[PDB]
């Protein structure tokens, strides 16, 4: 029990120090290790409700029972005297260092997980490398270190939205006295563009300072694991060598999917390549229907642009289908035009990109309805959003022993531990987890933890929320009401609803009752909150903080006894009482 | 404890139906009662913990243990039978109708609280009247049905706070690449006031039909309680008259206060004249340091004005005090200019409010600072934010032996009962109480509900969350940090806290280090939540959520299990590290 656990830390941790906050020899101890500039995790027994098992446990490697007592790779080093002499005997560098392999960690992969991991297991005193490279797109797009969300995912994708956000804002500011006419006021694609890379500049930089500074290496250059402790390096030379490591995190990613028809990869485009295009895409059709789809469809119409969105089957698959259907009806209501139940067969080439003049070229977009029907029709962009997929065919060798499922992602346990005892996957290609920054960040920095520093916390991947950045945001946590009913049985489920209009659209002279918001409960378990859900401005701002009460395990009543906060769109949750079963209509 | 519930719901109902959902006599009494379009509660006793225990209970007042039992005004009517035998005589309506008073309740009183109670009452079949009188302010200035919220606070404060903000959106707007130049934009007041009062307008006319489709009676008369049950009415030609009522409900709110000084009264306005104010105010002094006092600051600086406030003390006091020194720092370096430590001692007019060319007067402000030195200066418009109060004498006779306490605010046990047994009081002249609208609501309708349904549940006035809508936002939940010390002790007090920027920020080239946050934990009972505190952008929609948390008694371990929501401000309090006792820096 105890016992298990200090094995296993002492095993992995790099340096480890057990102490005591009151011992002056651990203070003695303390000092001399990062006058050094060692680096190491600390356990102050006199902190934990099991010290003295631990204290005697500690035994079973050192002989002795007493603190401070020194660990470096799982090997007793010494007590305060004999620290102390290897210092001033000036043994004490060579010590810390010494190792079976270069580095205590190799991470594969520069992105939010493997950032995280490699910062984090530093501060330990684990000797660390991070390895990023960047595929081009077809076209050639590349960009630097941060991986999928710094670059071409979740920032510059928001400042873009943000961008049509204030469209709105200008005409609303008519309504509230400001002389400025919206109609004689434009856009312009490039300004924006370089701005937005310009903070992504500002990240990639930030990052590099970042490793530096937490003595972490660098290595700008493709890994492949070719065994449990051998990662073999391409520069950009095409020089290959191997580095060996003790544990292995592989952080990869995604990268975006192309449809098996002519002309895709030639004359579309991905989200790749998107946010740093030199000219405005002008008339585009989006294939594809999930959230990116929707997001880039809906700020480029914000922006002027004329926007086709081509539907295989529904919108949103995978979230509440009513609260999805609300999200593509206020799209159609303002600008973007849809194609229903309808797939591509072939791009053909009428104008290649005018490269000089900072120009689109031209296409047509040759496709089929699900009845049979025909679709013709010319634009200036195709943009693909029909899905991600990994490739760890790239990164990992069949025979090291990794198992992959069916769709090429890692199979691990809880603690990220895949089928090869050493090595750890986190991120997107860690297979069921959802596919989200802040748990790629929070699992690398935990799996750090318990490799380095002796935690036991595990990352929670139940009841994450999440946010849309439609045109009008869709934030949602917990289940959809369909998937409640599955799970339950319509007769156990109750949802309370109700419309809303924010009091910034009243003088705006926006709309009445657009905005919606609903709680899907369970009422033979104290009416417990199973879904939160809510369409309308600041979505992201207003779900987050009641994901923690749902964490907590939160009812209907919880929500009634908690007050509002006036005036806020937030408040309408504080005092729901409209049920579905009652067929109450839930305007206002 | 069964027994005297049943006694106290019995004797305080209108109109009351003991049922079962299973029973056919039931639906067929429920179908008559509905026809007849006779309002009345209903206890479905098949869906209650001791619903057996209470049916024998019932014999107590009907001789009957059976289902169904209808009572009117604590008497009992009858079963089935007899209940059909009054309708086929038509009998039914007199006996529902005939009451020892004129209504079941008059609420005094036509605001927040006010308008809640008396719908809420209404629904289950009390006879209703609310009463509503507004008392011109010193120049004159007078409004309709809705309370200080809807016609001289939350909502038209709120609404010129986002015309202030939409300044900075029109900014920002070239920088994520929009053609307009702000730099020739202009604001126009009366332009704004206009869509204000219209919204406003559609305000009241609402609350007017929503009483009458609820049939309140409506009287626009000022109301004074002289005995417990005797209300006397003055209406606009000045008749007066008497009306009796069962239950009164005490709602009238406060007005603002003057300082003692010459010239105030004549000269200046309050928040009561500035929401409908026919010219813009110019340069403006504000007198006080209240959040009514930081927020019309806030927005009159925002569109353009010249405003100076005059601090007696501090700022906000009563809030956090860190929190409101960056509230107020951030409106100095903004453009709101500070006279701190200063009272006024006279105003003196220059110029008449010229009525005519739609402009302010002149006025010339003298004063004093608090180590002896002079203020004097001239100023367009003075604003006095200096406190509200009731004003109780003009309502309540002294001789019906309603308590008040040192403040002129009614004393009352916590479920808002006075010391006269029928009477009870609800909002801002509760003693004690958080002066919100949401609360005022909460406590009206949950009143409603234990007068005339049986209900039990009371409001809880614990740990209500704010917003202060200064042009940072300020939103908080619990207690302050020197609160929190002062009752536990420093050594028991752990304060996490982070700097923050909005990525809508970034590109807008806005400030790095302004927005910030803290979580303020009491170490001996598990890293309990004891406040949250948050200064940024959508303050009110980042607190809500967390609210429900506190409420449920969240720990620092809830909010770091729990995962974000990325890319949003309200994220940040998911992964907060720094503490206070540490001296690491919170910037980013
Ligand atoms: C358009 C778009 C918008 C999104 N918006 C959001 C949003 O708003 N919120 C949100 O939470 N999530 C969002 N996401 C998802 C988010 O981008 C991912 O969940 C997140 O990037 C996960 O990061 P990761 O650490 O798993 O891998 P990544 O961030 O993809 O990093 C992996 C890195 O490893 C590199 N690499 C690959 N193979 C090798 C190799 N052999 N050697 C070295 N390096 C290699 C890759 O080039 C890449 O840079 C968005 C995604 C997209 C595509
Ligand atoms: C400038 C300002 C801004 C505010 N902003 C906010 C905010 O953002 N959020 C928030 O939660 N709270 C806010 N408040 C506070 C909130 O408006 C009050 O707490 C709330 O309106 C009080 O509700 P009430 O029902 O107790 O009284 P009121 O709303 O004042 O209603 C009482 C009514 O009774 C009338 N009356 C008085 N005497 C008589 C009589 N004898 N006969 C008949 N009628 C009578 C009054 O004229 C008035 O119409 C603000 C207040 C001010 C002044
Ligand atoms: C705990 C060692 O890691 C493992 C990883 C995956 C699996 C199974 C689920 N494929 C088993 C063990
Ligand atoms: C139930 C109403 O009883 C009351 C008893 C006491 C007080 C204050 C004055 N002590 C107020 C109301």
């Known amino acids: 029990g105890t016992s298990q656990w200090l094995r296993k830390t002492v095993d992995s941790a790099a340096v480890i ?24 995790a600390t356990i102050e027994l006199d902190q934990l409700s099991n010290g003295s098992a631990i204290q005697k446990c500690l035994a079973s490697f050192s002989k002795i029972e007493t603190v401070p007592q020194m660990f470096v790779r799982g090997k007793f080093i010494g007590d305060s005297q004999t620290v102390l002499k290897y210092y001033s005997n000036d043994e004490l560098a060579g010590i810390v260092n010494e190792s079976k392999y270069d580095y205590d960690l190799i991470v594969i992969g520069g992105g939010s997980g493997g950032l995280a991991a490699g910062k984090e297991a530093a501060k330990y005193g684990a000797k660390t490398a991070v390895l990023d490279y960047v595929e081009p797109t077809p076209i050639g797009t590349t960009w630097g270190l941060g991986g999928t969300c710094v670059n071409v995912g ?22 509230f006295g400001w002389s400025l006419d919206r109609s004689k006021i434009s856009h312009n694609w490039s300004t924006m563009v370089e701005g937005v890379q310009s903070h992504i500049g500002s990240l990639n930089w930030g990052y590099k300072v970042a490793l530096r500074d937490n003595q972490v290496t660098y290595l700008n250059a493709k890994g492949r694991l070719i065994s449990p402790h051998e990662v073999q390096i391409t520069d950009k030379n095409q020089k290959v060598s191997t580095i060996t490591g003790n544990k292995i995190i592989l952080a990869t990613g995604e990268r975006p999917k192309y449809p098996e028809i002519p002309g895709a990869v030639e004359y579309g485009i991905t989200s790749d390549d998107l946010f740093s ?16 789809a929707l997001e880039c469809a809906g700020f480029l119409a914000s922006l002027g642009g004329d926007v086709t969105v081509m539907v295989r089957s529904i919108l949103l698959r995978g979230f509440d289908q009513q609260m999805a259907e609300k999200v593509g009806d206020y799209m159609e209501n303002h600008g973007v035009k849809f194609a229903k139940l309808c797939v591509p067969d072939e791009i053909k080439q009428l104008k290649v990109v005018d490269t000089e003049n900072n120009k689109p070229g031209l296409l047509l977009v040759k496709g089929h309805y699900t009845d049979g029907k025909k679709f013709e029709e010319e634009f200036e962009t195709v943009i693909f959003a029909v899905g991600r997929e990994p ?3 790239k990164v990992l060798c069949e025979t090291v022993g990794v198992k992959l499922d069916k769709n090429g992602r890692v199979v691990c346990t809880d603690d990220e531990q895949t089928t090869v005892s050493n090595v750890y996957a986190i991120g997107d290609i860690n297979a069921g987890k959802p596919q989200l920054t802040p748990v790629a960040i929070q699992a690398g920095r935990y799996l750090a933890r318990r490799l380095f520093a002796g935690a036991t916390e595990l990352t929670d991947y139940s009841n994450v929320a999440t946010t849309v950045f439609t045109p009008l945001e869709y934030g949602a946590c917990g289940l959809s009401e369909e998937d409640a009913i599955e799970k339950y049985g319509d007769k156990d489920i109750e949802v309370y609803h109700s419309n809303f209009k924010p009091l910034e659209w009243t003088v705006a002279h926006r709309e009445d009752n657009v905005c919606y918001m609903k709680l899907v409960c369970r009422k033979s378990d104290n009416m417990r909150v199973l879904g939160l859900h809510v369409l309308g401005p600041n979505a992201g701002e207003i779900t987050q903080g009641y994901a923690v009460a749902i964490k907590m395990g939160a009812t209907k009543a919880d929500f009634d006894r908690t007050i509002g906060i006036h005036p806020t769109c937030s408040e309408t949750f504080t005092t729901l009482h409209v049920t579905k ?4 209509s839930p305007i206002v």
Chains 1, 2 share one sequence.
């Open 277 to 292: 295009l030199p000219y405005f895409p002008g008339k585009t059709l989006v294939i594809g229907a999930s959230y990116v």
């Open 154 to 175: 979740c920032i510059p994708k928001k400042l873009m939205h943000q961008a049509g956000l204030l469209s709105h804002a200008l005409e609303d500011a008519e309504h």
């Open 17 to 40: 120090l057990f102490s005591k906050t009151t011992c002056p020899y651990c203070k003695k101890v303390k000092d001399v290790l990062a006058e050094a500039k060692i680096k190491h």
């Open 391 to 393: 490739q760890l065919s």
């Open 581 to 584: 079963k009652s067929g109450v």
